[PDB]
């Protein structure tokens, strides 16, 4: 069965590897097994396996754009002051370094400084743990690329975290994949506000659905996953993609539990 690493164990292993300056102790790119894919393995508490891990209590911040021209027109009719554009990529969960905004000046862009001239940041209790992991995955990923074959050490390395435009709250994006050959949302999506007891005694959650009882799909996803909703789930990070645009380390949602 597919191993899913626990988030606290993965974070700990990554932190320790950084401390030892040996990311290879935890992160391995299996180079030799058009657009190419290499498996991402991590070793955590003994077990080596492709990178799959769980996450909990992560706050999505951001607006997923609508996918259809009908919804685009509707939203622009209700808000003439702004321009909404059709989504061109798969919808994404966006998770910031902090769950609340650092205090910002009136420009809406610079972080405030205190009496001593210190940039004020929220406390550690507001730090997203998933962001902490992705930070370290990105360095493990960059360390592995610079240690890989020469043809790859030269290629453009795409970053996992947007840190600039100099962002006050950096962003990490989790892709909600829609199978392009079927137009069906791949990850199962459940509603945390709809707990349900099953016959086996366990309690789960109903499927995330819109007002009309339609399960989340590419056309209604922007209505169902909205800003400041809370997410648990499992992230799929089992591979890196070597395309003409460079080497990317895609993060995808394997399964989601949404609380809005």
Report on the architecture of this protein.
- With 260 residues, the chain is α+β, with helices and mostly antiparallel strands.
- It has a domain at 7-58 and 94-188 and 230-259.
- The chain is 19% helix and 30% strand.
- It has five helices and 15 strands.
- The chain has helices at residues 7-20, 69-78, 129-146, 150-153, 221-224; strands at 27-30, 36-44, 47-50, 52-59, 92-96, 161-162, 171-175, 178-179, 184-185, 188-197, 203-207, 230-236, 239-243, 246-248, 252-259.
- Strands 1, 2, 3, 13 and 14 form a five-stranded antiparallel sheet that branches. It has a five-stranded mixed sheet with strand order 4-12-15-10-11, with no helix packed on it. The chain has a three-stranded antiparallel sheet with strand order 5-7-6, with helices on one face.
- The protein starts with 6 loop residues before the first helix and ends with a strand.
- This is CP312R.
- The PDB classes it as viral protein.
- Keywords: CP312R, African swine fever virus, viral protein.
Distance between the termini: 31 Å
Helix percent band: 10-25%
The secondary-structure element order is HEEEEHEHHEEEEEEHEEEE
Radius of gyration: 20 Å
Question: What composes the largest sheet?
Answer: 5 strands, antiparallel
Structural class: alpha+beta
Strand content: 25-35%
How many separate helices? 5
Name the shape in a single word.
Answer: globular
Give the beta-strand count: 15
Essential attributes:
CP312R, alpha+beta, 15 strands, five-stranded mixed sheet
């Amino acid at each position: 069965t597919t191993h899913i690493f626990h988030a606290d164990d993965l974070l700990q292993a990554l932190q320790q590897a950084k401390a030892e300056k040996n990311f290879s102790s935890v992160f391995s790119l299996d180079w030799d097994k058009t657009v190419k894919y290499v498996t991402v393995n991590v070793i955590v508490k003994g077990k080596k396996a492709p990178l799959m891990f769980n996450f909990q209590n992560e706050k999505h911040v951001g607006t997923i754009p609508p996918s259809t021209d009908e919804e685009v027109i509707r939203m622009n009719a209700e808000n003439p002051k702004f321009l909404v554009k059709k989504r061109d990529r798969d919808p994404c969960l966006q998770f910031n370094k902090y769950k609340i905004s650092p205090p910002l000046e009136d420009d809406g862009l610079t972080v405030k400084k205190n009496e001593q001239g210190e940039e004020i940041y929220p406390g550690d209790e507001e730090k997203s743990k998933l962001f902490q992991i992705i930070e370290l995955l990105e360095e493990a990923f960059e360390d592995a690329v610079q240690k890989g074959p020469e043809a790859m050490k030269t290629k453009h390395v795409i970053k996992l975290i947007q840190r600039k435009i100099p962002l006050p709250n950096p962003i990490a994006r989790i892709r909600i994949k829609i199978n392009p050959a079927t137009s069906i949302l791949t990850p199962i999506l459940l509603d945390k506000n709809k707990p349900i007891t099953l016959q086996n005694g366990k309690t789960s959650f109903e499927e995330l659905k819109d007002e009309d009882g339609v399960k989340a799909n590419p056309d209604n996803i922007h209505k169902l996953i909205e800003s400041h909703s809370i997410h648990d789930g499992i992230i799929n990070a089992r591979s890196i993609c070597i395309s003409n645009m460079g080497i990317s380390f895609p993060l995808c949602l394997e399964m989601g539990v949404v609380k809005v």
